[PDB]
Structure 1
Amino acid sequence: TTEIHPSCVTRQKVIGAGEFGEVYKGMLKKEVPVAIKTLKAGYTEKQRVDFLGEAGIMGQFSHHNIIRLEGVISKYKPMMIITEYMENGALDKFLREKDGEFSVLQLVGMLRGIAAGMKYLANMNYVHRDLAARNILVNSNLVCKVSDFGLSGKIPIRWTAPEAISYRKFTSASDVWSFGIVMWEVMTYGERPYWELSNHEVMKAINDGFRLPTPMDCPSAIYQLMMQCWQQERARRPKFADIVSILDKLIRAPDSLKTLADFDPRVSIRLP
């Protein structure tokens, strides 16, 4: 963590909400665009511990696929966490606003980058607990950076592994389940997992053995990989090292992605 003087920061627009403050877009001194989370007067001891703890963990991460911390303001009030800014925004909204605009290889490359960031976090003994496309930022090189904006607080049942829902067992292996959901989010351009099923219906379907069907136009290898992320038995899921290795090999032999999984049509259209 670098300590930044408040005279170097200008808050411009509110872009979100913090636990005890606001999240802004701004400029950091030529100027550089930044995102800024503040801790406002009246914060509790616990909030200060969590806020500066968050800053400390982010300063420890140095990876291509993890959001970069520019610095912290801790010596003056209000306190601030300052990161790089991504004009393309969060991955879920990005894909939904750009439906069908990318190649299969571009989509799989986004997944490889997300997996590499997650392998790094898991190796550093950091369990994310809220991996979803809404918590991934996209830069102007299409590079995805794992982030955590806090709960949307809506609990993300349909991204969470059964053991984490059932008995609060959050590990890198429950993050692997979440990663499989993110794979499905990417390959569908941001569709809502399980569509209109309620949270209870999703849990019931998973316990009964159902799994999300293949996205349209999805490489067979990619659907196979996401399905193995959704094994009920935690020990049977791939580790992030396995996921990175597979995605890297598929990208480097790109003909491997041309074999597509069968898509199950809901609608039959008959014509001559």
Structure 2
Amino acid sequence: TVHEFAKELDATNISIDKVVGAGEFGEVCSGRLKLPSKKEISVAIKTLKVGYTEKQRRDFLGEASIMGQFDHPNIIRLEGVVTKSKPVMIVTEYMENGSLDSFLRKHDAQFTVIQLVGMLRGIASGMKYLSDMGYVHRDLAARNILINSNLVCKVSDFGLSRVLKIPIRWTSPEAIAYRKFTSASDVWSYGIVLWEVMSYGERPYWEMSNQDVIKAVDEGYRLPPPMDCPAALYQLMLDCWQKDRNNRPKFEQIVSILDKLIRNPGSLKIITNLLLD
């Protein structure tokens, strides 16, 4: 049940401002939540459509029951849910700059490498905690990361997450071949996210036929270095994309690698069709 890991909010404490998106289960809006302390915060509010199916309700709230297990600065925060009145609602922290892929596409080549690496470090830190908690996300992609007014990136979209629909472009070869999902398949996905960020939201493998994405990666081809990509970051992508999952870095190692790059920004000044790795 969702109440094990979600607070039931009093709807009198929720105000709705405007619609900001559309989900599988209903609308997404922005608004305000008054906390018990009287503090008021901005929030995102997702509603379950009128005339929902029992399955739609279970899936909708199930994603909240996963999210509510995590309390980490780089994982979207669940403020609570409304179930005792309808529409049913999930209330999360507000992320002013929306989904990371769309945000980067609006800002091609407009951030510093250190800004991009800060975004990537945040995502890695959230993934380190998720994987520490025994969860495999399975849908780690820039479209599933939200970014706030201060450029802090946070892991979202727990619909496909499982305790230890097949987005092929983001999925490791072993997970495609026989549904071998592990934290190491999430690391592969992270490598794709790293490519997405450094490419400012370019689509991984562009619009290659899915069968060709699967075959090419199996044959050892990899996405090419994004323009002006630091060598260190392309190498990190390649490491995330090791054929043997046991050779991929752990999230903790990724976080450490990025922290070193942040501490020695001069490192990033060495700069680096699919490439056969």
- The normalised TM-score by structure 1 is 0.89
1:84 is matched with 93
Code of the aligned partner of 1:33? S
Residue 210 of structure 2 is aligned to residue 205 of structure 1: no
Q: For this pair of structures, how many residues does the alignment match?
A: 260
Instruction: Please report how far the alpha carbon of residue 41 of structure 1 lies from its aligned counterpart in structure 2 after TM superposition.
Output: 4.4
Instruction: Please report how far the alpha carbon of residue 127 of structure 1 lies from its aligned counterpart in structure 2 after TM superposition.
Output: 1.0
1:27 is matched with 32
1:160 is matched with 171
Instruction: Please report how far the alpha carbon of residue 31 of structure 1 lies from its aligned counterpart in structure 2 after TM superposition.
Output: 4.6
Distance in 2, matches of 1:214 and 1:150, equals: 30
Distance in 1, matches of 2:68 and 2:190, equals: 24
What SS class does the counterpart of residue 222 from structure 2 fall into? coil
Code of the aligned partner of 2:49? K
CA distances 1:102-154 after superposition (whole Å, capped 9, x unpaired):
11111111111110000000001111111111111111111101111758xx6
Instruction: Please report how far the alpha carbon of residue 27 of structure 1 lies from its aligned counterpart in structure 2 after TM superposition.
Output: 2.6
2:10 is matched with 5
Distance in 1, matches of 2:179 and 2:18, equals: 37
2:67 is matched with 58
Q: Which runs of 5+ in 1 are unaligned?
A: 265-272
Whether the aligned pair in 1 keeps the contact of 2:66 and 2:158 (CA below 8 Å) is no
Instruction: Please report how far the alpha carbon of residue 260 of structure 1 lies from its aligned counterpart in structure 2 after TM superposition.
Output: 1.2
What SS class does the counterpart of residue 68 from structure 2 fall into? helix
Distance in 2, matches of 1:46 and 1:142, equals: 35
2:234 is matched with 223
In structure 2, relative to structure 1, the CA distance for the partners of 1:99 and 1:149 (3 Å cut) is farther
2:20 is matched with 15
Map 1:136-175 onto structure 2 (within 5 A): 136-148=145-157, 150=159, 155-175=166-186
CA distances 1:190-219 after superposition (whole Å, capped 9, x unpaired):
111122312111111111111111111111
What SS class does the counterpart of residue 100 from structure 1 fall into? coil
Cα RMSD (Å) of the superposition?
Answer: 2.0
CA distances 1:84-115 after superposition (whole Å, capped 9, x unpaired):
11121111011110111111111111111110
Q: Which is further off, 175-184 or 163-172?
A: 163-172
Distance in 2, matches of 1:105 and 1:15, equals: 29
Distance in 2, matches of 1:239 and 1:142, equals: 24
Code of the aligned partner of 1:50? D
What SS class does the counterpart of residue 47 from structure 2 fall into? strand
Distance in 1, matches of 2:47 and 2:174, equals: 34
Whether the aligned pair in 1 keeps the contact of 2:98 and 2:146 (CA below 8 Å) is yes
What SS class does the counterpart of residue 64 from structure 1 fall into? coil
In structure 2, relative to structure 1, the CA distance for the partners of 1:52 and 1:196 (3 Å cut) is closer
Q: Which runs of 5+ in 2 are unaligned?
A: 1-5
1:268 is matched with none
Instruction: Please report how far the alpha carbon of residue 40 of structure 1 lies from its aligned counterpart in structure 2 after TM superposition.
Output: 3.5
Distance in 1, matches of 2:253 and 2:57, equals: 37
Distance in 1, matches of 2:181 and 2:22, equals: 25
2:120 is matched with 111
Moved >4 Å (runs of 4+)? none
Instruction: Please report how far the alpha carbon of residue 177 of structure 1 lies from its aligned counterpart in structure 2 after TM superposition.
Output: 0.6
Distance in 2, matches of 1:27 and 1:141, equals: 19
- The normalised TM-score by structure 2 is 0.87
Identity value in percent: 73
Distance in 2, matches of 1:169 and 1:13, equals: 41
